[PDB]
């Protein structure tokens, strides 16, 4: 069987290559159905030169030679922890494909990787150490901040949550949060014992510095924002306050299974996650990809989803 | 009763003031016997202008109106967690003075605060999480690095310890360590799961960056070096590796009691700590203080101890 792989050959330039696919291999052959563009894929799109791009998606099983998943089973695809999804067929190990419930909105299950990242970070805090009596802080009014707020509220129901961001636009989407602040306007006496840093790039430095100042002593901080650079950190205060800083990144197949199991538990999560769904595009040519990527560039809030009909 | 307080009134300038002391107060009146100059006191000596300086010391109880400690009991003095010891009498709460065994070298028990700092840092790692099967790294071939190596070896006997420093002079004092390295010459494939950052100032940044690189994934790092400044930190790697960074500073009275209880357990500690004892000075005038402080400035390795005979 022949597989068409849609690779990025140059910034703002896609081209199709071919490779052979063994139906009777120990993998599970999957056709991607919906996928979502990620910031990391946008870095490459604009600026290992030939490669496939998307790595968050869900699809249907068209073949499973080992006979584990029946044909047509809708499954969320886990990528490799250290080749993308823009192709006619994706081959996964049987532990790298998580079955979904029979009826579910796939267009928003596409960005389940962000939820796994968020849930992984949350589980970095010992579950036995955190109750509904703690108080959480979240820097970042974007997708990670939103998903993290959702997860904390659903699974720490009686807890208190504060969100710190930069724009009224993005912060209005946080209604289930106990209170919402600007980084420009933080009141004195505000306190919390656990905090999540969901801001990237150069802004992560400012985020980290603020949560160092405002966090309660002996508090813990989970880092999520990628800097791809060094950031100045005030270590004197981490010492004086006894702060524990935990960095957490790539998630595991367990995080995907747990997130799926949570979709089953609180379908409220799927409905709240829908508010992250920005613009959607049906992809049937290459032109549809260039247009879709230009749109995710111009996108203010939320994720861009692609409907794979190649 | 009249107390003479020897304060620093100007950089390189001491002067004596007076204040009244109530023998019959709820405190315990203590005459300091031996004390040791600390880097923090040297910052002020050279460059809250009027204040007393030394904060690590041991002395004898001359009065205890509440009747808890008998007169002459030799006790290690705990300072206040957020006024110094260069005075004829020091008043402590009954929980701020730890009794010592009857026969012990006081000239080296003077710098028990460094041991409490080190032990506090070690206990930041959950004791149930660390066995004699772990492998420790220590940046810094100075006093904190030496004390930390001592404590780890005594209480994690079958564990492995590596020390990283800058000078052959200081690193030769580490013989009980499994192996000793330069920061200039670190071999590939070197690995460890828990690490201690015992370097201060601008050098802490380099230390932190190195232990970020070489530490095993999911490893923990205890920060001890004070920077009094920001330091660039590579957060991308803390994320990719899942590193947990714990800052730990001022110790508690529990740390002093535990350190004392350890002196009782392994008197080997007191003998190894003696190798830190640099130059000793009998202080009977102000001139003896200026000379002593100039000497702790010129000191390469170890602590400077003062014999209080004012």
Swiss-Prot record, chains A, B:
Protein EC: 1.1.1.405
Q: CDD domains in the record, alphabetically?
A: ribitol-5-phosphate_DH (cd08237)
- Which InterPro entries does the UniProt record give? ADH-like_C, ADH-like_N, GroES-like_sf, NAD(P)-bd_dom_sf, TarJ
Reaction(s) catalysed by this chain's protein? D-ribitol 5-phosphate + NADP(+) = D-ribulose 5-phosphate + NADPH + H(+)
**UniProt-listed GO biological process terms:** cell wall organization; poly(ribitol phosphate) teichoic acid biosynthetic process
Keyword set, alphabetical order: Cell wall biogenesis/degradation, Metal-binding, NADP, Oxidoreductase, Teichoic acid biosynthesis, Zinc
Subunit composition and interactions:
Heterodimer together with TarI. Can also form a dimer of heterodimers.
The molecule here is called: Ribulose-5-phosphate reductase 1
Species in which this protein is naturally found:
Staphylococcus aureus (strain NCTC 8325 / PS 47)
């Amino acid at each position: 069987m022949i597989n068409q792989v849609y690779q990025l050959v140059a910034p703002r330039q896609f081209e199709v290559t071919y490779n052979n696919v063994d139906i009777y291999s120990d993998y599970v052959i999957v056709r991607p159905l919906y996928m979502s563009i990620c910031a990391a894929d946008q870095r490459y799109y604009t600026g290992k030169l030939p490669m496939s791009l998307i790595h968050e998606g869900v699809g249907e099983v068209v073949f499973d030679s080992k006979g584990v998943f029946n044909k047509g089973t809708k499954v969320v695809m886990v990528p490799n922890t250290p080749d993308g999804f823009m192709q006619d067929f994706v081959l996964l190990n049987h532990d790298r494909a998580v079955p979904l419930p029979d009826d579910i909105d796939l267009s928003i299950i596409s960005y389940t990787e962000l939820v796994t990242v968020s849930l992984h970070a949350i589980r970095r805090f010992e579950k036995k150490s955190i109750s509904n009596k703690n108080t959480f802080g979240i820097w970042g009014d974007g997708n990670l901040g939103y998903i993290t707020a959702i997860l904390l509220r659903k699974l720490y129901p009686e807890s208190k949550i504060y969100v710190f961001g930069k724009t009224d636009y993005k912060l209005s989407h946080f209604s289930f949060v106990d209170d919402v602040f600007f980084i420009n306007k933080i009141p004195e006496g505000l306190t919390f014992d656990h905090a999540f840093e969901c801001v990237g790039g150069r802004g992560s430095q400012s985020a980290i510095n603020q949560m160092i100042d405002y966090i309660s002593p002996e508090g813990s901080i989970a880092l999520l924002g990628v800097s791809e650079f060094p950031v100045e950190v005030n270590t004197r205060l981490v010492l004086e306050k006894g702060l524990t800083l935990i960095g957490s990144s790539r998630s595991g197949s367990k995080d995907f299974q747990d997130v799926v199991d949570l979709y089953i538990q609180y379908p409220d999560i799927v409905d709240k996650l829908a508010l992250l769904k920005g613009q959607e595009f049906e992809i049937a040519t290459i032109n549809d990809l260039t247009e879709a990527f230009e749109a995710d560039l111009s996108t203010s809030w939320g994720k861009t989803v692609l409907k794979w009909i190649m």
